[PDB]
Symmetry: C2
Subunit: 541 residues, 2 copies
């Protein structure tokens, strides 16, 4: 698999999303102006891309068992979120919710984000996998979206006309009708686009990729709203459905339903099914939700958060999934290469977070003063990982020096999660010691340890586990004794869940998969800056 | 040369312009919404395309004599239009006019339209010609635009600060600074874009082509205003400078200044220089003119008209220029292939013009009732040319039948130009005979002639010349005796100039180049529907 192409591909696609976000947030493009790009993207560039690919599509080469299995995974997530919503939501909104929540959990950003990422990963090895984006996404719309429209019409009402309106909203969608038209013209034209119409469709289709990622960025500006507690739990559960339950079900359904002869091809097919699940929610769900003014804050916020969170989940998942197809030496180089990429994006995000914290002078205010110590520590671990990738072969004293930098800063990030939750507790109840304890104690622990992850082996993971455990207890006890500050609590919560993943992974290593557990530790250790950027790098400072 | 790729390339690029025009005119994208696509195009997609191509550019392979000669052709058109404007314009606006009129006459739509067309024509045979778009266009901006800004600042004023503002408006342009930055980073990066940044720049750059052509279409909606007579003559002279004087000077300057060893390569280089001149005015000139509220109606109208008129001039010119590199048998197939393309675009444009004339019921009103007879006749010639391209090999009676169709309709279009000018004369002064004379007389002339262009040879060109001559005299006498109706006069004027080109070409054939003269006759004969579409196919009916 060309898994090394994934970080370039993600950086491209999410960098274009970042360009849209920068442009819309800097008011280079206002929200009214952004509709022009959206109408271009959705009504010219996408239908042209659909039509071209659908007319060219060699249906006899389509693996219908793959389609079936992705589609059954989506249909099962639809039923699950639908019946769970109907059981759990209040009668006055359960039918609107049971329409849009399952469409959220199943409809997927396959064209703007999926296709560049699948083209990157698979055009060299498995170019037929690019077909299944164009198959699955529109067939998925045709099957699943009318049910949610039917549920919205049923909320409005509370039979043939309700069903007809559902199906008509689906047929009215340019994805659905340009795929029907492209299938019809696949049979008319016999899989050749006329050359004159071909490079017309090329021009429009080629323009889709960048303009759609950029428009997605523009749509993301300011859509993360301050949700109610219940709405936030619902948001988490819907994004878990999209980014964890659906791709697991996709991989499971492929492994149940595909019977292809080659075990290598089956493995790649179910790995593909997983990545196909991990694509974020389609912006079309939020367009529907805003247009019919239904559940807008959950669905818009969740579309934006799904987009941002799908990037690390895609990278981390795709690498995890290729570790069974790797051998321990290139596997070690792979996880240092992964960690170098994660530390680059983290360091860039952390430099930006630090610039904001400093130039806003928020670094002078509690809790942000201590948060700036956490962001300094996270910056030193991302510096330290890039430095280690160079120093890992070199002479012993350089390795020790960079190790002292890296583990003092890393253990410091753990201590600082604890000390941030203690800062919030001390702010809830009616700094020099906290800065010395946030750095000096975790720096001194490196001396205890001297007296990358297995250079000092069992002791290394022991000190690491103990530091993570102390951080979790410090933070859990201080958050419960407590039970802007909300954003700090959410950063601390995400970091505490990460520290728990990290603690359990280090413990499970200590009880034993090594390189996979080390990679998930490294993902937190060096990518935690991405979390800190998500919450404090994008605020209105 | 891959001159056969030009009609697919033009149809692509101007079809995307037509999509933008349809979208903006149908209010799929309003003028406020269109700014989002414009800001994307000009501030992200174009600077990325510039930066990528400039960083990749192998400067040691750049033919500086080509650059020099295009740049000197542009500089001479700048001086000409500048000094002509300063001599001829009134003092109260001559400096604003002498700034923007030469920028109009020299700055060129090289990125949105030039690059797709040059890539189409030359990527197979002469891929280095694609470099010179990225060289010439920004160096041309750097040299020529500050002079026009200096002239606008001088109008505002009426020295170091005026010159500084000119140069700063130029350096502020994303074309100029991303080319300076791309040159700097060409030397920094040594002609490799880092792979991570590479497909980021690919995504944005690839999105430019389609979004820029589409945005151009959106900018064209409603910009053709009703100019004063003087402003309309100025518009004609500025578009003549851009689309005739500049490309002639480009071809001349290349033929003066290039010394390349191969005569084939020199020929292709000066042919390229011609097509480079024929690119329409950059929308940036109109963006400048609207932003500084200078001479807006001439410059916006002229940018739109230059865009529409450059399409046939590019096609016709590029084919003319390849006739010296062709042999009489493929040359005959070439002009039937040309005529088939011209008759397809004409027939599509004429079917639309007829649909508008009919469904608006304007076909019931004078002069539009007689204009609808002209549009029916033009539709029958474009039908007849497509039918002839099939029948040209076939048995004698079929050839006669299609010839009767084709020449009765063709001679009818000439008669109808006359009879439209007589209709305007009879409407100026305080229909059955006119419809019988518009068709029956030119149909009967085919019998005289029986009693494609040389099937009946000297008699064919004689009857054709006489019919064109009678049409010119009928129309000239009726327009002068006369001296919505303005649009009819302009259609009649354009057609009279075309009938004069056609009359003189047929006469010059009768005195003698044959296939080139026949091709220019065929260009009017079958492309006249494009003129009728330009004036009556796009009205607010
Ligand atoms: C694989 C794992 C993923 C699947 C769903 C994800 C969660 C779904 C939604 C949210 C809410 C969102 O919280 C905010 O910071 C807002 C991002 C983190 C979180 C807990 C995600 C963390 C990572 C999770 C558990
Ligand atoms: C080559 C020839 C070109 C160069 C300039 C062109 C002219 C420049 C501007 C105009 C105005 C414009 O008139 C309208 O219909 C408006 C288009 C036709 C015309 C006469 C063009 C006709 C074709 C010309 C003579």
């Amino acid at each position: 698999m060309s898994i090394t192409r994934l970080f370039p591909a993600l950086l491209e696609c999410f960098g274009i999303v970042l360009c849209g976000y920068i442009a819309g947030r800097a008011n280079v493009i206002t929200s009214t102006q952004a509709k022009g790009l959206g109408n271009f993207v959705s009504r010219f560039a996408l239908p042209a891309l659909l039509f071209k690919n659908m007319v060219v599509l060699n249906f006899s080469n389509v693996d219908w068992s793959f389609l079936y299995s992705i589609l059954i995974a989506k249909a099962s997530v639809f039923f699950i979120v639908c019946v769970l919503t109907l059981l759990v939501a209040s009668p006055d909104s359960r039918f609107s919710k049971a329409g849009l929540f399952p469409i959220f959990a199943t409809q997927s950003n396959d064209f703007a984000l999926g296709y560049p990422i699948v083209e990157a990963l698979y055009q060299t090895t498995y170019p037929e996998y690019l077909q299944y984006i164009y198959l699955v996404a529109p067939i998925s719309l045709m099957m699943l979206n009318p049910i949610g429209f039917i549920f919205c019409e049923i909320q409005k009402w509370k039979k043939i006309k309700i069903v007809g309106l559902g199906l008509l909203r689906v047929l009215q969608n340019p994805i659905v009708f340009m795929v029907f038209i492209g299938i019809a013209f696949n049979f008319i034209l016999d899989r050749k686009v006329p050359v004159y119409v071909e490079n017309f469709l090329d021009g429009l289709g080629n323009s889709f990729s960048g303009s759609a990622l950029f428009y997605l960025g523009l749509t993301m500006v300011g859509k993360i709203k301050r949700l109610k507690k219940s709405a936030f739990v619902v948001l988490i559960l819907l994004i878990t459905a999209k980014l964890l339950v659906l791709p697991l079900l996709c991989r499971e359904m492929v492994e149940l339903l595909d019977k292809g002869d080659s075990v290598v091809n089956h493995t790649s097919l179910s790995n593909y099914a997983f990545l196909y699940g991990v694509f974020p929610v389609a912006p079309g769900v939020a367009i529907f939700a805003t247009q019919f003014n239904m559940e807008v804050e959950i669905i818009t916020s969740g579309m934006v958060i799904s987009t941002f969170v799908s990037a690390p989940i895609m990278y981390v998942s795709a690498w995890l999934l290729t570790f069974p197809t790797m051998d321990p030496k290139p596997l070690a180089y792979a996880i240092q290469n992964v960690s170098f990429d994660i530390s680059i994006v983290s360091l860039i995000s952390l430099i930006w977070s630090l610039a904001i914290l400093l130039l806003s002078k928020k670094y002078k205010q509690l809790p942000h003063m201590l948060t700036t110590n956490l962001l300094i520590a996270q910056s030193i671990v991302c510096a330290g990982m890039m430095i280690w990738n160079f120093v890992k072969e070199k002479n012993f004293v350089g390795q020790i020096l960079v190790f002292v930098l890296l583990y003092s800063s890393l253990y410091s990030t753990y201590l600082w999660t604890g000390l941030l939750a203690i800062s919030l507790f001390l702010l809830k109840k009616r700094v020099g010691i906290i800065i010395i304890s946030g750095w000096g104690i975790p720096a001194l622990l490196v001396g205890v340890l001297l007296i990358s992850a297995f250079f000092y082996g069992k002791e290394q993971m022991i000190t690491t586990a103990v530091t993570l455990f102390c951080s979790i207890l410090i933070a859990g006890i201080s958050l419960m004794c407590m039970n802007q500050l909300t954003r700090h609590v959410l950063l601390c919560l995400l970091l505490i869940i990460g520290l728990f993943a990290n603690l359990s992974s280090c413990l499970w290593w200590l009880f034993n998969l090594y390189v996979e557990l080390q990679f998930f530790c490294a993902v937190f250790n060096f990518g935690q800056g991405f979390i800190s950027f998500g919450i404090f790098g994008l605020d209105k400072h």
